[PDB]
Structure formats: structure tokens, C-alpha cells
């Protein structure tokens, strides 16, 4: 009924604490990330090209090409917080 949009972005390496967003990770079974949802966004910490590509309520489907349901909760958060690494994200936009 409503549009379903998916965006692939690449976030360049930055300094510690400045990835530009946080997540809420729900882990239904075991310690795997079932769903990864963007919680907060600091637009000024995001490069101009990606500043309008990630919003609160968006869900992260894949991190650097890996579906998040196969990652442990710590691996998801490590990837976001390891600002020395380029971070590729597959983002499902919320309608």
C-alpha cells in the first residue's frame, strides 16, 4: 500500500564517538540481533551525502553486506562504534 524504500550507503571513517547515530537492538533468541533500529541521529556528524539517508525509526538490514540477524548484538554495536572503519549500511526507510 505504502512505499517500501531501501537505501545502501557508505559512511567514511571518522573520529571516536562521531558515527552520527545510535541503535536499539532487539535480540529475540540467543544473543543474535533480530532487528536493528536507528534510535537517534546527529545530522552534523554525518557526511553531507548521507545526511538525509538515515532517520530515527529506520531499520538496518545489513552491515557491510552481512544480514544483521546472523550477527551477535556486540558485533552490531562494535561495527557502529569502530569509527576507524568505513561502515556500509543497508537501510530500510520507515513509512
Numbering used by the authors: 145 to 239
Paper text:
These protein kinases phosphorylate the actin depolymerizing factor cofilin to suppress filament severing, and are key nodes between Rho GTPase cascades and actin. LIMKs across species have a common architecture, with two N-terminal tandem-zinc finger LIM domains followed by a PDZ domain, a predicted unstructured region enriched in serine, proline and glycine residues, and a C-terminal kinase domain. The LIMK PDZ domain is unusual however in that it does not interact tightly with carboxy-terminal peptides.
The crystal structure revealed a compact globular domain resembling a partially open barrel that is typical of the PDZ fold. We observed the expected canonical six β-strands and the canonical αB helix, but unusually, found that helix αA is replaced by two 310 helices, which we term αA’ (residues R187-H189) and αA” (residues P192-N194). In addition, we found a third 310 helix in the βD-αB loop that we term the αB’ helix (residues V212-T214) (secondary structure nomenclature as per). We observed good electron density throughout the structure and that crystal packing appeared to induce a conformational movement in the βB-βC loop resulting in two orientations visible in the asymmetric unit. Instead, they harbor KRGL and RRGL sequences in LIMK1 and LIMK2 respectively, replacing the first hydrophobic residue with a conserved arginine residue, Arg163. Unusually for a charged residue, we found Arg163 in a similar orientation. It caps helix αB, hydrogen bonds to the carboxyl oxygens of residues Ala223, Ile224 and Gln226, and also hydrogen bonds to the carboxyl oxygen of Gln229 within the αB-βF loop. This arrangement seems to provide a rigid anchor for the C-terminus of the αB helix.
